[PDB]
Amino acid sequence: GLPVMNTPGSNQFLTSDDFQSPSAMPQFDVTPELNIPGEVQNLMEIAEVDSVVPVNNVEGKLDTMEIYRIPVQSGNHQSSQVFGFQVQPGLDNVFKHTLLGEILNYYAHWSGSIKLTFVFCGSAMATGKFLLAYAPPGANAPKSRKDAMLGTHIIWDVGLQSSCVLCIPWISQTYTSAGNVTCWYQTGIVVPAGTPTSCSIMCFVSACNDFSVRLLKDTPFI
């Protein structure tokens, strides 16, 4: 009874199908759920957390805590570069193994805004100024302190603030075609008698709320 007609696709196993299946243990009442703290609904809750960037990824110190410390030297060098990098999460070595980088490497297309925080870890007696500069994608990195001043920049006085924040708006993926960030000595570091001479800066990266990902794929790390 009930005349019926089989269509193409019958009796195939499609690895991504979605069908009701027969239970092998129907007479078994399951343990009820517990209210465990710390539940997750979405992977973007992991990428919105700050993590420390290994900005000092040069030879001889890829296996020490020193990889995370930007060196600030003593004396008068008030126009020299402190650091610089291209902003390319997912592809570039300095951003590749962070919490944000590890997520982005599961997807073939992504886009959003990024947040960078810088923190000064010197003694409370040290004072000085840094110049933090941002170049957009398609622009060359500045070569001097003066042309970095002629673009988008902030002047950061560490005797007043211990930390600075930046939000970068046009991030996508695929000799890069990406924006960059650089830091310059505006003045030099000045200390009283009896304080350590050298010091360090640390970088933290995170994602802002408008971040999106597409086309789940396999990661290239295991």
Binding site: S113, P136, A139, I168, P169, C208
Partner: protein, 245 residues
């Protein structure tokens, strides 16, 4: 019955009996606000991008196959609009193009004026690749040929195939205008911004191509002038870039 038009510190004069083609029915305009709200803020120059830029005239003689220009980068040396091409990473714009002739009632001829989006061109060698110089020379026009060309890295520019592999009598599918020396001598085309993304970089992509092609050659007799001049004038409209702050 003459109108005088001033854009900025420029002034040109046209006839009020002009006819205007709006490309696909669409006037140019700004991408409104909220395609990419949060960290994609644009800016607009509106200073000396909205102004008439006039190229050099070309000379129409008895055997002229035709001329073509690429947009943009025909304007990469044109004052401020060209400065903005180097300072900004992304942009977009529409255009108004005026084409004019200077001829008498004792001359005769017929021109097609067409604006072609994504005019990808073929190489003179079938297993070859085209050079960057052979595609454009900026504010100087490239020339079509009347027979098939040779040499390495050159566009195959025989005029009957228009460098694209189609029949040249079928280019009327694009926004176009006819200039018949008998009845008119001018043509205005208003082009909007046409892409498959909202903004783009203006140096490694040619949005569209302006072509001018004689279908009936210039003819004159005893002691008329032996050439006719053609003049092209361009005004950018609703230009917009990525914000820098």
């Amino acid at each position: 019955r003459v109108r005088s038009i001033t854009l900025g510190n420029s002034t040109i004069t046209t006839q009020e009996s002009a006819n205007v083609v709006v490309a696909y029915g669409r006037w140019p305009e700004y991408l409104k606000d909220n395609e990419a709200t949060a960290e994609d803020q644009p800016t607009q120059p509106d200073v000396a991008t909205c102004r008439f830029y006039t190229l050099e005239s070309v000379t129409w003689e008895r055997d002229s196959p035709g001329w073509w220009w690429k947009f943009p980068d025909a304007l990469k040396d044109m004052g401020l609009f060209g400065q903005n091409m180097y300072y900004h990473y992304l942009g977009r714009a529409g255009y108004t193009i005026h084409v004019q002739c200077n001829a008498s009632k004792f001359h005769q001829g017929c021109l097609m004026v067409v604006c072609v989006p994504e005019a990808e061109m073929g190489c003179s060698q079938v297993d070859g690749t085209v050079n960057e110089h052979s595609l454009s020379e900026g504010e100087t026009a490239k020339k079509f040929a009347s027979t098939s060309t040779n040499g390495t890295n050159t566009v195959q520019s025989i005029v009957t195939n228009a460098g694209m592999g189609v029949g040249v009598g079928n280019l009327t599918i694009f926004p176009h205008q006819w200039i018949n020396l008998r009845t008119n001598n001018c043509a205005t085309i208003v082009m909007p911004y046409i892409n498959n993304v909202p903004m783009d970089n203006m140096f490694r992509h040619h949005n569209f191509t302006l072509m001018i092609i004689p279908f009936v050659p210039l003819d004159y007799s005893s002691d008329s002038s032996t050439y006719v001049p053609i003049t092209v004038t361009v005004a950018p409209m609703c230009a917009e870039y990525n914000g820098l702050r």
